[PDB]
């Protein structure tokens, strides 16, 4: 599982044609603020295919 297949799972809005997303900021978390953590209701938007 050499997992160099990172992609994006979550975004605030729909991606427009011919735009690249590079930021690793934490996903939406509308109810509680994540404040820069990967705890409860806090996921990084980068997962691999495996």
């Amino acid at each position: 599982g050499n997992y160099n297949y990172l992609y994006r799972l979550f975004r605030k809005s729909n991606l427009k044609p011919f735009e690249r997303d590079i930021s690793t900021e934490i996903y939406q978390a509308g109810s509680t603020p994540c404040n820069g953590v990967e705890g409860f209701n806090c996921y990084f938007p980068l997962q691999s295919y495996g």
């Epitope: 799972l9 109810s31 509680t32 705890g39 409860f40 209701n41």
Partner: antibody, heavy 123, light 107 residues
């Protein structure tokens, strides 16, 4: 504010195994003690929780009636008794404090994380 | 919360048949889902976790897939131990609800 876990080990399913973590560097208050489990390579799962003034005990959806918790503030150590052990409960155990025992808006606790002792169950 | 339902509410099959259990969600569940197996008068057990991973001690003929909203579970061959009721629950957000339950009987 250091949390050191202990009590994890290898044991057959169906047997009891009590784990504990001592609270050090924490000023005494009515902080809601919580427990979180992590399957390795998976997400985060909460287990149970006890708030201040005793009582107020709740568990997760699948551990109702099989987990027992009691809080003793004199020893500054919290223990959980494990009953009806299955092969699913193999995970990494983190015990959290959330450090917000406020009278107004007690919810919204920043759950801290300790070193953590995992458990292994082999059938 | 999340209002969930499962279909069918009951099933009837013999030994060796191919049946499927499907249960969807009203909110985006992606992949974090568990399929419990519980017997009458006994404790539950987990067979498939995260909709794609086979648990330790679980036989490999229980195979599942699904992403987004629609979820499914497939049985290659049925066994004498397989005849029981089945639950599927979500594991994403603020506290979850269980399923109404399906049942497989001898036809």
């Amino acid at each position: 504010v250091q949390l050191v876990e202990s009590g994890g080990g290898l044991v057959q399913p169906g047997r009891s195994l009590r784990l504990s973590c001592a609270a050090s560097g924490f000023n005494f208050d009515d902080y809601a003690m919580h427990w979180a489990r992590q399957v390795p390579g998976k997400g985060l799962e909460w287990v149970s929780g006890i708030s201040g003034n005793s009582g107020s005990v709740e568990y997760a959806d699948s551990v109702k009636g099989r987990f027992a918790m009691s809080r003793d503030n004199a020893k500054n150590s919290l223990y959980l008794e494990m009953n009806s052990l299955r092969t699913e409960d193999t995970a990494l155990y983190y015990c959290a404090k959330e450090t917000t025992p406020w009278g107004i808006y007690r919810s919204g606790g920043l759950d801290v994380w300790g070193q953590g002792t995992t458990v292994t169950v082999s059938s | 919360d999340i209002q969930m339902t499962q279909s069918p509410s009951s099933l009837s099959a013999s030994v060796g048949d191919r049946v499927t259990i499907t249960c969807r969600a009203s909110q985006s569940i992606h992949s974090f889902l568990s399929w419990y197996q519980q017997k009458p008068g006994k404790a539950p057990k987990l067979l498939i976790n995260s909709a794609s991973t086979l648990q330790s001690g679980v036989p490999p003929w229980f195979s599942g897939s699904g992403s987004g909203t629609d979820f499914t579970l497939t049985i290659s061959s049925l066994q004498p131990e397989d005849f029981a009721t089945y639950y599927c629950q979500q594991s994403y957000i603020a506290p979850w609800t269980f399923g109404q339950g399906t049942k497989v009987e001898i036809k």
